[PDB]
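worker-3 :: picked Cystic fibrosis transmembrane conductance regulator
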Amino acid sequence: TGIIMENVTAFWEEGFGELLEKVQSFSHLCLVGNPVLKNINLNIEKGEMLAITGSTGSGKTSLLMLILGELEASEGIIKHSGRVSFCSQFSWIMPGTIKENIIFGVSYDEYRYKSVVKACQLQQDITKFAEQDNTVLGEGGVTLSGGQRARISLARAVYKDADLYLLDSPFGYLDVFTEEQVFESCVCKLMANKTRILVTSKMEHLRKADKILILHQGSSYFYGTFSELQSLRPDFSSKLMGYDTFDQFTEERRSSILTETLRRFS
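worker-3 :: tokens ->
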């Protein structure tokens, strides 16, 4: 499916704040009628990848919530059709085997399963276990690494048959060469013709994206292509692309460089 937003604004509503916590004073934001997002525009064709970045707490997750229908649009038009599949920043794990987690509530299909496992780089993980993907997890999958939890949880969202995929910051952990391989095999190849939104703080993702959205303080700091970012926001670009190996900084450091740059060049 394509997705279009045309001058969309959404305000804090009661209970929105608690959802954001689950997924990543509220009453005062609700009472004062503040925008969570203000004047958003995007137009993503069927099969394109939109990369969303910005400062911390800039409204990245809330934008996905609008798509999901968990946040309501007070003004403006949003258009998108079909099933959506959402991979939260929080990597949830249910009681049962790794395989059961990846096909949770959906039916097993062999070619599809093996293909998602491979592209999400799960094969290197399961091979460390005596029962491989029949290994039993407790709820939360607490003895795994963050990257292992995020890969199973991404594999579950991607195995889902959907017209639109929302992937909220899966590439945030220390095993950064693995994440580079997941970006390439899963997001770029396996899902190359699935419409998809990727929230990210890595510049390679902006470079490979069909469209880019950068958010700051609830506002659209930039929407366009990567070529248009270099030309129309040269201040921002030169600072970020000027790093040697930005994408291998910790996520906290990458998000802090982005915030500061965004505060700078308003």
